[PDB]
From a paper:
Human multidrug resistance protein 5 (hMRP5) effluxes anticancer and antivirus drugs, driving multidrug resistance. To uncover the mechanism of hMRP5, we determine six distinct cryo-EM structures, revealing an autoinhibitory N-terminal peptide that must dissociate to permit subsequent substrate recruitment. Human MRP5 was demonstrated to play a critical function in regulating cellular cyclic GMP (cGMP) homeostasis, which is essential for many physiological processes, including the maintenance of vascular smooth muscle tone and cardiac contractility. hMRP5 also influences signaling transduction pathways and may contribute to drug resistance in anticancer and antivirus therapy. From a clinical oncology perspective, hMRP5 can directly contribute to cancer drug resistance through the efflux of many anticancer drugs, such as methotrexate, cisplatin, purine analogs, pyrimidine analogs, doxorubicin, and antifolates from cells.
Since the R motif does not contribute to the EM density in the central cavity of hMRP5, we generated a further truncation mutant hMRP5-Δ1-94 by removing the flexible region from Met1-Thr94. This deletion did not have an significantly impact on the ATPase activity and overall inward-open conformation of hMRP5, suggesting hMRP5-Δ1-94 retains dynamic conformational changes to enable substrate transport despite lacking the N-terminus. However, the peptide-derived density was lost in the corresponding position of hMRP5-Δ1-94. This indicates the central cavity density arose from the Met1-Thr94 flexible region, revealing an auto-blocking mechanism where hMRP5 is inhibited by its own N-terminal fragment. Collectively, removal of the autoinhibitory peptide does not disrupt the ATPase activity or conformational cycling of hMRP5; thereby, the empty conformatin of hMRP5-Δ1-94 likely represents a critical apo state primed for substrate recruitment. We found that the helix backbones remained unchanged during the transition from the peptide-autoinhibited state to the apo form. However, the side chain orientations of several residues differed, including Tyr244 (TM2), Glu289 (TM3), Phe452 (TM6), Phe988 (TM9), Lys1040 (TM10), and Arg1148 (TM12). In the apo form, the Phe452 side chain reoriented toward Phe988 (Phe452-Phe988 distance ~8.4 Å). In the apo form, Lys1040 rearranged towards the cytosolic side. Meanwhile, Arg1148 moved from the cytosolic side to the pocket center, likely due to the loss of the electrostatic interaction from phosphorylated Ser60.
Numbering used by the authors: 97 to 501, 574 to 786, 838 to 1169, 1179 to 1436
Write the structure that this text describes.
């Protein structure tokens, strides 16, 4: 039966032994492939379960009605038959995992206390213990198998129904926030988890109740205190979890703000370095980091108070019960005490899994509510009426429709067209053509009139849908491939030029791409698809919205007039050009019919259409270096030693408390003789000993000591790990990524913004948690083995082969698990891609007929994703069962060891060995899983560490005054692999002289500005300012003088005062004087807080002119002797332009002025004009002389610019 699951018997299904061959193949080969994973096993396909659920829901709706219908009843009825069997198996395992400690151990200890010699009794008891262990383990395996299969079935069915519903929506208004995910995406994983890890809820209370009753039976009124301890304990941990969640949410808000600021200042680095403004941003980031650190610290304390639930509770309950029981006058023995302790050690198993069940159930309930909210919407309704006459295609007779908002836009619409007729519709903006287009497709609701439609539609929207596939099939849209049709379509739409542009051929994709395409080409492929589809009636809505006249004419005369001569065409557009050739024109205005007839008749009528026409014509290897780096960053070996010492001290304290309990009992009476009864005798009772308060005092002291040590350990570990994480990344990374050069160009800025947002989370939140859990588990295992082997020295024989077996099995398990995970991870993505591409643009999908193709593709991709999930879960259960077998063997060995030696060991030590052997169950799986999880988190540190690893000449400040600018053959190159931009450039500028820069783009205009600031080192020559070489002056000293106004005005978040002067080097009087000169003082004065008013990002509070005026203000604040102006007139109005020229000439008239712009009039008034071409200086003369020379290129450019106005 194909899949092996359907052929296995009961024994193979109970042990998961049908998966064994895959492990052997994975070991032999090295990696797996999708060719031999498996297929799907039937009984889990989408169609069968979808039909079943649909039938159930329809029956429910018919039975009750759409007011009180519930999805919970339907889901329960769907999953009713198997949950009962799962519950029965769980009850059997919980009942059989308690009969061991309560009945088997007590009889064994009581036998040890007796004075006989038998082997049959002890052998029978050993047999009983082993059999109970086996039964418990195998029952648990069966429960898990059943639950996994049921969950997979339910998830598939619900997801397929959810995506089936969406394709028939006629009120699409919710954004792609619910539809894309919460209905057909990972939202079904919650419904899977509710049946996989949900349920299992009646597992804790039952065993807890049974244990409480048994304890009261054994001891009684003094045995009635363990219940009190447990009840008073657990709600405290609930409260601690709530507080941790609250603090975590607040920290999330703060770090979101920090990363927002980091993104804001990551790409302005030229602006920052041009003024040497690196001080402020460091301060701001440091403050935000401090606040985040404090909140994280508090959350860490409250989260770490929790991880020690079980042994602490056991010790507390035992101490209280036994102390109160003894300090009243009573009797105790080894059997009772150690039976009670062993029972206390088995109550705390299902209380390790109840909370996950509760939270999973809550999430599932919310998801079901959302699904039921979706399932009630308006369906589709397609018109099936046929025209009375065969010559009629569309029919309209006094039909009125209202758009559902119900808003009327159409009123008494009547028209009639026939096959082979071209009809054009004209109207203004908002006339109501779109309402008619929406009504003819049947989307609009019907209120009055009759509708008749025959034919097939071909719809071209004003926007291209663009489908994630190859060009050939995208044009094909699921049609048979041909040759003459294909080339006729290409020639008709003149797509051949575009084919040569494509790198490879017409086989690439039109998805995200790297070059995208133009709107006109998208329109061209849209009409290509439409006219290749070969439908009956064509609906064309303004396909030529943004095209040139020529291509419109060729497209028209090639396709519309020839191909669709006999095909009905409906044309809706605003332009009145092609309407000459149309055989019918209908004018729509104010939702009523105005004109009807041919074009010539329309001109004959001479109505509003004539007026409008006239107006228009007018891998994960992770070597040890990572661990070494983390340890070195944490502080050194001393921190490691301190933390390990504290862990060992805590666990040793717990072990000492239990040992003292064992040591008190052995000292029976103390060779004390009493005269009770009628004759003297030596008592054997523990109460008779005169010294009893000693031992109770030492008990209380032990409890207090253990509590104090646990608190100290938690605090110290949290603080140390937080310091280790906070130093490395931020301190040694932000200080380095603020002084590279050119590194910012040949590297995307979207992958340096990352590693500041995700890696910080991975290093701050999860690593300490996982490390703490792992270390605690390992140390506990070591202590348990040592404590057992201390009493019986021969126990260190059955530990060797078990270690060898564990080492053999672990590697195979790890390889199989990794390989199975990778396949699911790789195969996830096309599912999501198809879902997104289908959700975007439902109109065209519903336009022709296509629903079945998309549904089939969805189902196929669903199954291909589903299979490896099931395989992965089965592998995990396989490993768990093997480890359980090892533990059972160890327990049986120690029990037999106790039995075989009798009469030479006191009963108390035998009880202690038994009490410590039971604790070993269910630890190895936890240890292995936690080791893998904490290994997977040590990858971020590697990337961060990799990215981290990869004079004098101070003269007097006489720079001002005679500020001469001289160039002597300056050469520079942007990169070492590119041609030199500047080639022997030399010029001298006199002080207080105005110079303009003109030339074509790419000829080296920006090179002068880049090299004047020494941002890129020159390759030859030298530049001297005021007789001082710029190479001998420090970068900080040189940049503090010159100023440049950028072509685009940018502003940062904060107050106006910070945006004007962050260094607080100026008082208010100069700021007001500067603001008054640019006539913006009144605007700031009108602000309620003036200079304290808050400024949003990008300066959205102000208009463009205000931003530019603020830029000139901050330029005027510095009072520089040398100024560079760079294209201040990009898209700014003429009034503001004359304003800025007036302000510049009134303010910058006492300093050297250099201008680089595309407007000749800006540099017309300059003393001299510079012309550059191909990196060489061409012309250097006054404007009067340059204009007088015809051969000058500047004069030719001026004539060409002037001809654009005089001629036109």
């Amino acid at each position: 039966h194909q899949h092996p699951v359907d052929n296995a018997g009961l024994f193979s299904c109970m042990t998961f032994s049908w998966l064994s061959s895959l492990a052997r193949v994975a070991h032999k080969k090295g990696e797996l492939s999708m060719e031999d994973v498996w297929s799907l096993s039937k009984h889990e396909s989408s169609d069968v379960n979808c039909r079943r659920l649909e039938r159930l829901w329809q029956e429910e709706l018919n039975e009750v009605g759409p007011d009180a219908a519930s999805l919970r009843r339907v889901v329960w009825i769907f999953c009713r038959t198997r949950l009962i069997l799962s519950i029965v198996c769980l009850m059997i395992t919980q009942l059989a995992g308690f009969s061991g400690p309560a009945f088997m151990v007590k009889h064994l200890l009581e036998y040890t206390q007796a004075t006989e010699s038998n082997l049959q009794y002890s052998l029978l008891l050993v047999l009983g213990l082993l059999l109970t262990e086996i039964v418990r383990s195998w029952s648990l395996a069966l429960t898990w198998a059943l639950n996994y299969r049921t969950g997979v079935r339910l998830r598939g069915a619900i997801l397929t129904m959810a995506f089936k519903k969406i394709l028939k929506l006629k009120n699409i208004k919710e954004k792609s926030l619910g539809e894309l995910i919460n209905i057909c995406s990972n939202d079904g994983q919650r419904m899977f988890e509710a049946a996989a890890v949900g349920s299992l809820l009646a597992g804790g209370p039952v065993v807890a109740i049974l244990g409480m009753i048994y304890n009261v039976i054994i001891l009684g009124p003094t045995g009635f205190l363990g219940s009190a301890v447990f009840i008073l304990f657990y709600p405290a941990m609930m409260f601690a979890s709530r507080l941790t969640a609250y603090f975590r949410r607040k920290c999330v808000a703060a770090t979101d703000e920090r990363v927002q600021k980091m993104n804001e200042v990551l790409t302005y680095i030229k602006f920052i370095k041009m003024y040497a403004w690196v001080k402020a941003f460091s301060q701001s980031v440091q403050k935000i980091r401090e606040e985040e650190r404090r909140i994280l610290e508090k959350a860490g304390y409250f989260q770490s108070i929790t991880v020690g639930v079980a042994p602490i509770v056991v010790v507390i309950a035992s101490v209280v019960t036994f102390s109160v029981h003894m300090t009243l006058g009573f009797d105790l023995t080894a059997a009772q005490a150690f039976t009670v302790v062993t029972v206390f050690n088995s109550m705390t198993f299902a209380l390790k899994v109840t909370p996950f069940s509760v939270k999973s159930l809550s999430e599932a309930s919310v998801a079901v509510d959302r699904f039921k909210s979706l399932f009630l919407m308006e369906e589709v309704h397609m018109i099936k009426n046929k025209p009375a006459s065969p010559h009629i295609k569309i029919e309209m007779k006094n039909a009125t429709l209202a758009w559902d908002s119900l808003q009327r836009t159409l009123h008494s619409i009547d028209l009639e067209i026939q096959e082979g007729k071209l009809v054009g519709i004209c109207g203004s903006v908002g006339s109501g053509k779109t309402s008619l287009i929406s009504a003819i497709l049947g989307q609009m609701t019907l209120l009055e009139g009759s509708i008749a439609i025959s034919g097939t539609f071909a719809y071209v929207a004003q926007q291209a849908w663009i489908l994630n596939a190859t060009l050939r099939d995208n044009i094909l849209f699921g049609k048979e491939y041909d040759e003459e049709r294909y080339n006729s379509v290409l020639n008709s739409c003149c797509l051949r030029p575009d084919l040569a542009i494509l790198p490879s051929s017409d086989l690439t994709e039109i998805g995200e791409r790297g070059a995208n395409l133009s709107g006109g080409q998208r329109q061209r492929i849209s009409l290509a698809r439409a006219l290749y589809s070969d439908r009956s009636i064509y609906i064309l809505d303004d396909p030529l919205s943004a095209l040139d006249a020529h291509v419109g004419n060729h497209i028209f005369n090639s396709a519309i007039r020839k191909h669709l001569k006999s095909k009905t065409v409906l044309f809706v557009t605003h332009q009145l050009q092609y309407l000459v050739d149309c055989d019918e024109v209908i004018f729509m205005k104010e939702g009523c019919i105005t004109e009807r007839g041919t074009h010539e008749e329309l001109m004959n009528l001479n109505g509003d259409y004539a007026t409008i026409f006239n107006n228009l014509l007018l891998q994960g290897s992770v070597p040890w270096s990572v661990y070494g780096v983390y340890i070195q960053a944490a502080g050194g070996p001393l921190a490691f030693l301190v933390i390990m010492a504290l862990f060992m001290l805590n666990v040793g304290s717990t072990a000492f408390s239990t040992w003292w309990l064992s040591y008190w009992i052995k000292q029976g009476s103390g060779n004390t003789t009493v005269t009770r009864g009628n004759e003297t005798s030596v008592s054997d009772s523990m109460k008779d000993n005169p010294h009893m308060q000693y031992y109770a005092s030492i008990y209380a002291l032990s409890m207090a000591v253990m509590l104090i040590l646990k608190a100290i350990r938690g605090v110290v570990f949290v603080k140390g790990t937080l310091r280790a994480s906070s130093r490395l990344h931020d301190e040694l990374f932000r200080r380095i990524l603020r002084s590279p050069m050119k590194f910012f160009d040949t590297t995307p800025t979207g992958r340096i913004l990352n590693r500041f947002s995700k890696d910080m989370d991975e290093v701050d939140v999860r690593l300490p948690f996982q490390a703490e859990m792992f270390i605690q588990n390992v140390i506990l295992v070591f202590f348990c083995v040592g404590m057992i082997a201390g009493v019986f020295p021969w126990f260190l024989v059955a530990v060797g082969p078990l270690v060898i077996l564990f080492s053999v099995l672990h590697i195979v398990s790890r390889v199989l698990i990794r390989e199975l995970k990778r396949l699911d991870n790789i195969t996830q993505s096309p599912f999501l891609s198809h879902i997104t591409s289908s959700i975007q643009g439902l109109a065209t999908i519903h336009a022709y007929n296509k629903g079945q193709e998309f549904l089939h593709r969805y189902q196929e991709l669903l199954d291909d994703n589903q299979a490896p999930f099931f395989l992965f879960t089965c592998a995990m259960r396989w490993l768990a069962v093997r480890l359980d077998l090892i533990s059972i063997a160890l327990i049986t060995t120690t029990g037999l060891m106790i039995v075989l030696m009798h009469g030479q060991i006191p009963p108390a030590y035998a009880g202690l060995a038994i009490s410590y052997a039971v604790q070993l169950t269910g630890l190895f799986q936890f240890t292995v899983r936690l080791a893998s999880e904490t290994e997977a988190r040590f990858t971020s540190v590697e990337r961060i560490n990799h990215y981290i690893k990869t004079k004098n000449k101070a003269p007097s400040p006489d720079w001002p005054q005679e500020g001469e600018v001289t160039f002597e053959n300056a050469e520079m190159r942007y990169r070492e692999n590119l041609p030199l931009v500047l080639k022997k450039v030399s010029f001298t500028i006199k002080p207080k002289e105005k110079i303009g820069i003109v030339g074509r783009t790419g000829s080296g205009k920006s090179s002068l500005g880049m090299a004047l600031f020494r941002l890129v080192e020159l390759s030859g020559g030298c530049i001297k300012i005021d007789g001082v070489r710029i190479s001998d002056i420090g970068l900080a000293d040189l940049r503090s003088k010159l100023s440049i106004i950028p072509q685009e005005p940018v502003l940062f978040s904060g107050t106006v005062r910070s945006n004007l002067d962050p260094f607080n080097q100026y008082t208010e009087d100069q700021i007001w004087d500067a603001l008054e000169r640019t006539h913006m003082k009144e605007c700031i004065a009108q602000l309620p807080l003036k200079l304290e008013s808050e400024v949003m990002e990008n300066g959205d509070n102000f208009s463009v002119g205000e931003r530019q005026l603020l830029c000139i203000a901050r330029a005027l604040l510095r009072h520089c002797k040398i100024l560079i102006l760079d294209e201040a007139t990009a898209a700014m109005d003429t009034e503001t332009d004359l304003l800025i020229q007036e302000t510049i000439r009134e303010a910058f008239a006492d300093c050297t002025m250099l201008t680089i712009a595309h407007r000749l009039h800006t540099v017309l008034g300059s003393d001299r004009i510079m012309v550059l071409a191909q990196g060489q200086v061409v012309e250097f003369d006054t404007p009067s002389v340059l204009l007088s020379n015809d051969s000058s290129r500047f004069y030719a450019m001026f004539a060409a610019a002037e001809n654009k106005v005089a001629v036109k």
